[PDB]
Amino acid sequence: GRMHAPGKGLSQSALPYRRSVPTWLKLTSDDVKEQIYKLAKKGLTPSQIGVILRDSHGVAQVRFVTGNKILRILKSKGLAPDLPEDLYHLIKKAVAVRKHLERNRKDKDAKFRLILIESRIHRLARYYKTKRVLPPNWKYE
Amino acid sequence: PLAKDLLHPSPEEEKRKHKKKRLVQSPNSYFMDVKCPGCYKITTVFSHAQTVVLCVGCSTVLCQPTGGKARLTEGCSFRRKQ
Amino acid sequence: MQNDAGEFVDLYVPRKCSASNRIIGAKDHASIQMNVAEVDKVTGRFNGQFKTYAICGAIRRMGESDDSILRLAKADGIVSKN
Amino acid sequence: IVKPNGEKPDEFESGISQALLELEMNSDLKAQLRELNITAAKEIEVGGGRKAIIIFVPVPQLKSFQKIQVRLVRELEKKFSGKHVVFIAQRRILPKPTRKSRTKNKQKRPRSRTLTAVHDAILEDLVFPSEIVGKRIRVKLDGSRLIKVHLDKAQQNNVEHKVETFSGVYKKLTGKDVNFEFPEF
Amino acid sequence: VRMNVLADALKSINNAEKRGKRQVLIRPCSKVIVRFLTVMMKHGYIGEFEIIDDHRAGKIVVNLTGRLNKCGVISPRFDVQLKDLEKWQNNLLPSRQFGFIVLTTSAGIMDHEEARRKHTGGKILGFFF
RNA sequence: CGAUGCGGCGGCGUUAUUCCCAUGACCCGCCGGGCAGCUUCCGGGAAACCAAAGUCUUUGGGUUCCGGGGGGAGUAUGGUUGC
RNA sequence: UUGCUGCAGUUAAAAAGCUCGUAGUUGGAUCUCUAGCGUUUACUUUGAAAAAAUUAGAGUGUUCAAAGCAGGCCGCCUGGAUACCGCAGCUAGGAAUAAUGGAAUAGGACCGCGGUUCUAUUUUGUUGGUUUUCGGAACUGAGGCCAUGAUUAAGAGGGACGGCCG
């Protein structure tokens, strides 16, 4: 089921068997790379970049056409962000809830949900410190 | 019950059954090409799409983001690719 | 069944179910032994030969004796293919 | 034209090298073949007498060979004897590092340099015209395996008669029997 | 979450056989399951099975003959020696006439009788009879 | 097995936004996750009952808390928390 | 009726009011040898080491037996065996199973190539002064080659976005 919820939701992406590039795809590996770079400069997230490239330009899977993933391409050049996507998003959700809580002292629900977010930050931070993508002195405030 | 070929299910039963609980996984989504009424240039869009997409040819909205599949604008004709 | 002497040391060899291949017990009163007749290829008359099926109590209770008889009849060529 | 790693060419590939030398000046494929080159070429007896031709080519050029393969096979098959020709990737297969290895395994062996990955790549490269859609592995009472490959209906008539060629050629360089079916959709 | 995939595989086969289904679907598929099923087939309990290969992690479809009484897993993987094997085949097997314990040994995954024959201990995976 | 709540998917025909589509309200199916219900010799249980309280002598998926005849007793004392 | 094998916890005695969480336990597919090694263990099989007595157990008519270590043949021919000995520590095979890592701002592997410092203690029959190479190291300025280097994306999980819902 979920991390911090009783729901057993089964809703994710089902990537097809055929890894083969579609015959109708005109864009080449280098052309896609140039597109990813141009998108990345506008200040976007690998998630958003992948969605925009899937919707607009008709690239089913970047890793199939190029042979490398979005964060990996941006890492290889050096247009990758300092904090990983998911940790950054948890921190901005945490500070948003804390900003709400600072006015509302009675909102017990907000306090409970903050505790649940903080737990996700710490559990993800520990993993990133284990893989040595963050420094070992990295704390949360 | 008791005799079904789990190996070779009938293709209509295969399509009905959930995308993740199929014998071999395949997405229900597809890639389709759009022909805008006030333009000559062709564009490709994802069946369940999430961003309002723009045709830079005439600078007009094509498909709308919805709960499921993206609703195309009136006049713009969609056709299945492979 | 057989000791190293050679002779068979047993009261009776029990019948196994034609469908599920379970041993039909001594006091399995819901177990059935059905005889299905053989027709003459030309005239379509009961020649005298018959083909026997046995179904255990479980398969009778489940209500899968029907499909089990049918699929056996299909396999043995009593029922026409398709 | 041919650059072996042993620095020792054989009569067969030295034969086919010339059989390719015409297609530059004869056809409009000179711009393609000039940059390209084959490494090895072999013959195998499948279907009890049927001679099938293998051409081992380098991996980095293979992507370019894929573009011209569909035409080149007919051109080759017309130039010399009407025989079934197919292009294979020359895959260096580095063995699994055991507790008693040589002073060579200083680096991690890539997953692409593994028996399973190589065999799957060779089966992909073999049937390039008809992209593999499904794969099954049946185990029979004796214990022996059988690989059932499920191809697409887009180029069925293209390689319908090559099922014998593929069924024969696979067992030579893998050591596993293969069968080929065409599902409806 | 899922731990000891063999446990789910053997439990699935056991339930299917008790219910009287002629085929059973197992997911996911690993070498350990394939070798275990191979040992079960070699002694003539299941018969032919197919490995439905998707790119993620395979599924097995097993033809079931009405022969298998029980097929159990032993968790965790206990350390079994030749001297202790009498005790195990005394405890788990229903008779000394038939039934087999499947050990993973340095030689490979194999039944207890072959383990005695080749003279090597290992880890207990499961039993069937 | 028939309902039901939220979302999605496909399809005759009624109606409203005049009409065409397109959205609502219905109608008939499907898929996933929830609140449940009816039926059943799947199988358990001392039974009452339970599709879990089933897959248990044919006894091992992972892990936490926790009972050991009835009283004395949630008592006495000690510690710790609290005005 | 203390349950590791092997017990219970709806009503017989029993699941914390509820969620988070560190330690603890458990953890999804996938990779077929050149006197030094090979990535290191756990696991398993073998070997030596391990006091007798005791226990199992060979031989032996204590008159039988519990015992005892004696005895048997007409000066002789005998016996005083053998096994087990948790764990851990040594020793040599196996490599399934289970942990761990071998190259990701390439100071990565493998090949011949440029120089800085020092040294081996053979050498100009032996002997005193300079300069050497060979034998052997760290530091580097480049070059060729690797089929050059990232398995998959869990009906595991986090996060993103879309239209709702209560």
UniProtKB/Swiss-Prot annotation, chain B:
Entry keyword annotation includes Lyase: no
Keywords: Cytoplasm, Diamond-Blackfan anemia, Metal-binding, Nucleus, Phosphoprotein, Ribonucleoprotein, Ribosomal protein, Zinc, Zinc-finger
Modified residues (Phosphoserine): S10
Keyword rRNA-binding: no
Residues that hold Zn(2+) according to the record: C36, C39, C55, C58
GO molecular function, one term: zinc ion binding
Cofactor(s) named in the record: Zn(2+)
Disulfide-linked positions: none
Bound cofactor: record note: Binds 1 zinc ion per subunit.
Zinc finger intervals, C4-type: 36-58
Tissue: Expressed in a wide variety of actively proliferating cells and tumor tissues.
Region feature (Disordered): 1-22
Broad class of the protein's primary localization: cytoplasm
Gene Ontology annotations of biological process type: cytoplasmic translation; ribosomal small subunit assembly; ribosomal small subunit biogenesis; rRNA processing; translation
UniProt biased composition (Basic and acidic residues): 1-15
GO cellular component: cytosol; cytosolic ribosome; cytosolic small ribosomal subunit; GABA-ergic synapse; glutamatergic synapse; nucleolus; nucleoplasm; nucleus
Subunit record text: Component of the small ribosomal subunit. Part of the small subunit (SSU) processome, composed of more than 70 proteins and the RNA chaperone small nucleolar RNA (snoRNA) U3.
Family of this protein: Belongs to the eukaryotic ribosomal protein eS27 family.
Function in brief: Component of the small ribosomal subunit. The ribosome is a large ribonucleoprotein complex responsible for the synthesis of proteins in the cell. Required for proper rRNA processing and maturation of 18S rRNAs. Part of the small subunit (SSU) processome, first precursor of the small eukaryotic ribosomal subunit.
HAMAP family in UniProt: Ribosomal_eS27
Protein name in UniProt: Small ribosomal subunit protein eS27
Organism placement in taxonomy: Eukaryota, Metazoa, Chordata, Craniata, Vertebrata
Swiss-Prot record, chain C:
Cellular compartment(s): Cytoplasm, Cytosol; Cytoplasm; Rough endoplasmic reticulum
Modified sites of kind N6-acetyllysine: K81
GO cellular component, one term: endoplasmic reticulum
Disulfide bonds: none
Domain of life: Eukaryota
Keywords: Acetylation, Cytoplasm, Endoplasmic reticulum, Isopeptide bond, Ribonucleoprotein, Ribosomal protein, Ubl conjugation
N-acetylmethionine sites (modified residues): M1
Main location per the UniProt record: cytoplasm
GO molecular function terms attached to this record: RNA binding; structural constituent of ribosome
One of the GO biological process terms: endonucleolytic cleavage in ITS1 to separate SSU-rRNA from 5.8S rRNA and LSU-rRNA from tricistronic rRNA transcript (SSU-rRNA, 5.8S rRNA, LSU-rRNA)
Per UniProt, location of the Glycyl lysine isopeptide (Lys-Gly) (interchain with G-Cter in SUMO2) cross-link in this chain: K41
PANTHER family documented for this protein: 40S RIBOSOMAL PROTEIN S21
Subunit structure: Component of the 40S small ribosomal subunit.
Described function: Component of the small ribosomal subunit. The ribosome is a large ribonucleoprotein complex responsible for the synthesis of proteins in the cell.
Family according to the record: Belongs to the eukaryotic ribosomal protein eS21 family.
UniProt protein name: Small ribosomal subunit protein eS21
Species whose genome carries this gene: Homo sapiens (Human)
From Swiss-Prot, chain D:
The gene coding this protein: RPS7
Full protein name: Small ribosomal subunit protein eS7
Family matches, as PROSITE patterns: RIBOSOMAL_S7E
Family: Belongs to the eukaryotic ribosomal protein eS7 family.
Disease in which the protein is involved: Diamond-Blackfan anemia 8: A form of Diamond-Blackfan anemia, a congenital non-regenerative hypoplastic anemia that usually presents early in infancy. Diamond-Blackfan anemia is characterized by a moderate to severe macrocytic anemia, erythroblastopenia, and an increased risk of malignancy. 30 to 40% of Diamond-Blackfan anemia patients present with short stature and congenital anomalies, the most frequent being craniofacial (Pierre-Robin syndrome and cleft palate), thumb and urogenital anomalies.
Post-translational modification: Phosphorylated by NEK6. Ubiquitinated. Deubiquitinated by DESI2, leading to its stabilization.
Keywords of the record: Acetylation, Cytoplasm, Cytoskeleton, Diamond-Blackfan anemia, Isopeptide bond, Nucleus, Ribonucleoprotein, Ribosomal protein, Ubl conjugation
The UniProt record lists the keyword Ubl conjugation: yes
Covalent cross-link Glycyl lysine isopeptide (Lys-Gly) (interchain with G-Cter in SUMO2) as placed by the record, residue numbers: K63, K67
GO biological process per UniProt: cytoplasmic translation; negative regulation of ubiquitin protein ligase activity; negative regulation of ubiquitin-dependent protein catabolic process; neural crest cell differentiation; neural tube closure; positive regulation of gene expression; positive regulation of intrinsic apoptotic signaling pathway by p53 class mediator; protein stabilization
Residues found modified as N6-acetyllysine: K67
A molecular function GO annotation: protein kinase binding
Organism domain of life: Eukaryota
Curated annotation (Swiss-Prot), chain E:
Location of this chain's protein in the cell: Cytoplasm; Nucleus, Nucleolus
Taxonomic superkingdom: Eukaryota
GO annotation terms (biological process): cytoplasmic translation; positive regulation of cell cycle; positive regulation of cell population proliferation; response to virus; ribosomal small subunit biogenesis; translation
Short name of one Pfam family: Ribosomal_S8
InterPro entries listed in its UniProt record: Ribosomal_uS8, Ribosomal_uS8_CS, Ribosomal_uS8_sf
GO molecular function (one): structural constituent of ribosome
SUPFAM superfamilies for the chain: Ribosomal protein S8
GO CC terms, sorted: cytoplasm; cytosol; cytosolic ribosome; cytosolic small ribosomal subunit; extracellular exosome; membrane; nucleolus; nucleoplasm
Disulfide cross-links: none
Keywords for this protein: Cytoplasm, Diamond-Blackfan anemia, Nucleus, Ribonucleoprotein, Ribosomal protein
Cell inner membrane is among the record's keywords: no
Family listed: Belongs to the universal ribosomal protein uS8 family.
Subunit (UniProt): Component of the 40S ribosomal subunit. Part of the small subunit (SSU) processome, composed of more than 70 proteins and the RNA chaperone small nucleolar RNA (snoRNA) U3.
Name the record gives this protein: Small ribosomal subunit protein uS8
Origin species: Homo sapiens
